[PDB]
């Protein structure tokens, strides 16, 4: 069943809103993974001792009671709950610092990064951007089972000394798969311009659902097999846009909107989509107040043997939904109805329902499959 606790998603929702407001395209990212990146940077900073600085201060809403033992066990527990090896789904979060030749990585830091944050550090030579780009891109492929093939070009490494890269990959099956229909194209009414077309899937089922008066949107939950993950969809009522619904969403208002959902008979129509989304996170992080780590006053003394700072942060994520699930092509197993018909733009997210973790967040402006 749905998560009954309070999600620690204040930062997640803030950062998601910043990304969405600046891209007029489909978007998908992993807000939880962004917090992992920020916490690794926190761990690398001198500031992080229970000592003060604008770095320690700004990385705040991501750190746990500014107590490092708690921070490690917290993020470690959430990473392991999400990525738990199991027969039902495959989820992998991968994170690497790619560090220039001349930098000496502190061993105790590689230890903490691997153990608590399931992150690693590798040496490269930025004096050879071409070789380095190849190294980073092959790492992306290897850690996403080829779902993602590249994330940087030589040009995006220009001037870099440390690049922090995160990717995420997820394969899963719907608990309730859609019937497969060969031909089901219909119009899709995008936010701007004339309608486009999409390929749709439709079923009747019992799902947690509500038409939220507060948000001005319908909300729907489709669970994946494994008793852990579910995808939520927030579909603005026709009177409202994704941007208007976004402005209404915050931790408390999303808490209540999900709280109001209950199991209903629902006829669900969703457009199929497959896409990926890559971004350098420097600019959006700066926009939401995380600035000191990109400043001339930044340092990483607990990562790099002594001043260097993170040059660029990249994140990439791919997402697919079809009748069977996400990256799914086989399924060993197959009047008061409410109607949820997503033929206009909507928001979605995938959550660990045992802990509240916002593992994926995205929006569909033009679904292409």
Swiss-Prot record:
Disruption phenotype: RNAi-mediated knockdown in female causes spontaneous melanization leading to the formation of melanotic pseudotumors and a shortening of lifespan; spontaneous melanization is reduced in double SRPN2/CLIPB9, SRPN2/CLIPB10 and SRPN2/CLIPB4 mutant backgrounds. During the mosquito midgut infection by the rodent malaria parasite P.berghei, severely reduces oocyst numbers due to an increase in ookinete lysis and melanization. Does not affect ookinete formation. Causes proteolytic cleavage of CLIPA28 and CLIPC9 in absence of E.coli infection.
InterPro entries: Serpin_CS, Serpin_dom, Serpin_fam, Serpin_sf, Serpin_sf_1, Serpin_sf_2
Modifications the protein undergoes after translation, according to the UniProt entry: Protease CLIPB9 binds to SRPN2 via the hinge region resulting in the cleavage of the reactive bond. This leads to a conformational change in SRPN2 which traps CLIPB9 and distorts its active site, resulting in CLIPB9 inactivation.
Consequence the record notes for mutating residue 326 to W: Inhibits interaction with CLIPB9 but does not inhibit CLIPB9 peptidase activity. Cleavage of SRNP2 by CLIPB9 is not affected
GO molecular function: serine-type endopeptidase inhibitor activity
Glycosylation sites: 267, 297
Chief place where the protein resides: secreted
A Pfam family recorded for this sequence: Serpin
Motif stretch (Hinge region): 324-328
PROSITE patterns found in the cross-reference section: SERPIN
Subcellular location: Secreted
BP GO terms, sorted: defense response to protozoan; innate immune response; negative regulation of endopeptidase activity; negative regulation of melanization defense response; negative regulation of protein processing; negative regulation of proteolysis; regulation of immune response
Alphabetical UniProt keywords: Glycoprotein, Immunity, Innate immunity, Protease inhibitor, Secreted, Serine protease inhibitor, Signal
GO cellular component, one term: extracellular space
UniProt family annotation: Belongs to the serpin family.
Function: Serine protease inhibitor that functions in the melanization-mediated immune response. By preventing the activation of phenoloxidases through the inhibiting of serine proteases CLIPB9, CLIPB10 and CLIPB4, negatively regulates melanization in the hemolymph. By preventing melanization, has a detrimental role during P.berghei parasite mediated-infection and invasion of the mosquito midgut.
Protein name: Serine protease inhibitor 2
């Amino acid at each position: 069943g749905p998560f009954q606790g309070q999600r620690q998603n204040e930062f997640d929702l803030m950062f998601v809103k910043e990304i969405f407001k600046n891209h007029n395209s489909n978007v998908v990212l992993s807000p939880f993974s962004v917090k992992i990146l920020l916490t690794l940077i926190y761990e690398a900073s001198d500031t992080s001792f229970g000592a003060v600085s604008n770095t320690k201060r700004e990385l705040s809403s991501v750190i746990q009671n500014d107590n490092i033992d708690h921070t490690r066990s917290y993020y470690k527990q959430l990473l392991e709950s999400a990525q738990q090896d199991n027969k039902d789904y495959d989820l992998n979060i991968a994170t690497n610092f790619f560090v220039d030749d001349f930098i000496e990585v502190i061993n105790k830091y590689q230890q903490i990064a691997n153990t608590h944050y399931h992150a690693m550090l590798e040496k490269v030579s930025y004096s050879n951007p071409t070789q380095t780009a190849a190294t980073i891109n092959n790492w992306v492929s290897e850690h996403t089972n080829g779902r993602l093939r590249e994330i940087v070009t030589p040009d995006s490494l220009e001037g870099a000394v440390i690049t922090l890269v995160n990717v995420i990959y997820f394969k899963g099956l719907w608990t309730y798969p859609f019937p497969e229909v060969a031909n089901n194209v219909k119009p899709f009414y995008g936010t701007r311009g004339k309608p486009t077309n999409a390929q749709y899937m439709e079923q009747n089922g019992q799902f947690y659902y509500d038409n939220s008066a507060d948000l001005g949107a319908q909300i729907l939950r489709l669970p994946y097999r494994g008793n852990k993950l579910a995808m939520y969809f927030i579909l603005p009522n026709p009177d409202n846009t994704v941007n208007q619904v976004l402005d209404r969403i915050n931790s408390a208002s999303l808490h209540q909107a999900l709280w109001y959902m209950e199991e209903n008979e629902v006829n669900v129509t969703l457009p199929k989509f497959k896409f990926d989304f890559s971004e350098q996170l420097n600019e959006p992080l700066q926009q939401v107040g995380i600035r000191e780590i990109f400043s001339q006053n930044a340092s990483l003394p607990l990562l790099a043997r002594g001043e260097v700072r993170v040059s660029r942060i990249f994140q990439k994520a791919g997402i697919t939904i079809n009748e069977l699930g996400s990256e799914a092509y086989a399924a060993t197993e197959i009047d008061g109805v409410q109607i949820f018909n997503a033929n206009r733009p909507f928001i979605f997210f995938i959550e660990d329902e045992t802990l509240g973790t916002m593992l994926f967040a995205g929006k569909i402006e033009n679904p292409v499959f």
